[PDB]
Design a protein around this ligand. Sequence first.
Ligand SMILES: N[C@@H](CCC(=O)O)C(=O)O
Ligand SMILES: N[C@@H](CCC(=O)O)C(=O)O
Ligand SMILES: [Cl-]
Ligand SMILES: [Cl-]
Ligand SMILES: [Mg+2]
Ligand SMILES: [Mg+2]
Ligand SMILES: [Mg+2]
Lengths: 241, 243
Amino acid sequence: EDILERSKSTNEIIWGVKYDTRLFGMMDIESRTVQGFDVDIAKAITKKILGDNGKTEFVEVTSKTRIPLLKNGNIDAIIATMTITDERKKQVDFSDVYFDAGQALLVKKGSQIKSVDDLNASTTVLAVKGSTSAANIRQHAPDAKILELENYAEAFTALQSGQGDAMTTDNAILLGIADENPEYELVGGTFTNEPYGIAINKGQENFLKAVNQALEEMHADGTYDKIYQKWFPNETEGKVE
Amino acid sequence: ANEDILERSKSTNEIIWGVKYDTRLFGMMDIESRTVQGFDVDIAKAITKKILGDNGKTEFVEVTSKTRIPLLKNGNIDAIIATMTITDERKKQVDFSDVYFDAGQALLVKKGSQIKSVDDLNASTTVLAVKGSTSAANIRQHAPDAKILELENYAEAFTALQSGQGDAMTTDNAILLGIADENPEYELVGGTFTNEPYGIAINKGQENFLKAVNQALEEMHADGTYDKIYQKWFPNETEGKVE
Ligand SMILES: N[C@@H](CCC(=O)O)C(=O)O
Ligand SMILES: N[C@@H](CCC(=O)O)C(=O)O
Ligand SMILES: [Cl-]
Ligand SMILES: [Cl-]
Ligand SMILES: [Mg+2]
Ligand SMILES: [Mg+2]
Ligand SMILES: [Mg+2]
């Protein structure tokens, strides 16, 4: 079914977002609503496509569940800190890039670790089980011990308790943890490129074109820049110019 | 300059590209064959064949980071494809194509250096960059205490590194790789500390040519021409590829 047609009929686009990723998609206990950069970009795209009265629905996805839910039609699009990769394009299409992340390290302030180069056989790195981040750290720091945890929260609790010397995932995700926990900081720049895209099921070319046209309009009229400034007021590197 | 580049091509069957002549892997003059070679050169040739068809001709003109925008805006070249990062400040001067390479600024040091990342640059360290370059400006932001010695070109910056006139050299990671492959005593350290998405720059008021360049890139991504060219130049480096 053509999602562009259906979404006009139901006046709604269904977005798969994270619920546990501060700055991108986080379930907010105060308002009982999900918030972040991915959420606000979804809302803005939906208004470009459907008009100012268009509705958004958000459905919680993880890195593990997002493509299966997309392929089964539970959601119309994934916007969930999702890197565009050739491997994933065997399964989905992607929009234009809307954020430029990169894999990085989070440590306790005062750590002797200042770069991925410092992750030798003496170090233990925390990563999420099944993630691209875990796979990447094994190639970039082949002698480090990797401890895999269920999710970001569990990885950060293990870092705080000293079960590992560093935690790894995308820089902008780690930022959402560092700004909340000032005893921790990012170190060493990035050692991958993680360009985020919006994933759409194969065979939805009309909807993909509409999403890309929405993004184009948002870049042209400053909506994109406003949303970026809101969530990343002191870090410009991730912005798509 | 104001003459429309696609209209002119109806007569000349040519696109004139501004490329580096000194940047191994991107645009480098080969002395034996007297021809420039690199990823940027190959992308330019492939785009020209998409726009003009099978017998479309390419012409290459040397630019530097200093001369590329002046030459473009004066009409000496039709487009810049020369390791050029897209920035909003540059978008005041030129239009840009879609991103065709994903670089990032990095550091090159002698193996064994105490410097392991941008975090180790400070008032006691001298970093080598090219005069007037954005790389020098990015260092002043990410290493605000570092001393900067700006040199006229990459070759000069690298010999200054080799003779200890600076402690680290900085420019885009993919460019430093072109240097580290030539010089095994030196290595990249610390990953990247900026994003440097490369675009093709086109003068303002050339919107039909800009659309043609973007359509050419679209076609090359759709049919694997882009991927083949990427694999030729960066067979063991995956991160710069635009998917
Ligand atoms: N952006 C990376 C890591 C974060 C995530 O999985 O959401 C990826 O898509 O693999
Ligand atoms: N890509 C960076 C550094 C290389 C160059 O100047 O060509 C820039 O456009 O400034
Ligand atoms: Cl050497
Ligand atoms: Cl590809
Ligand atoms: Mg990057
Ligand atoms: Mg990639
Ligand atoms: Mg591709």
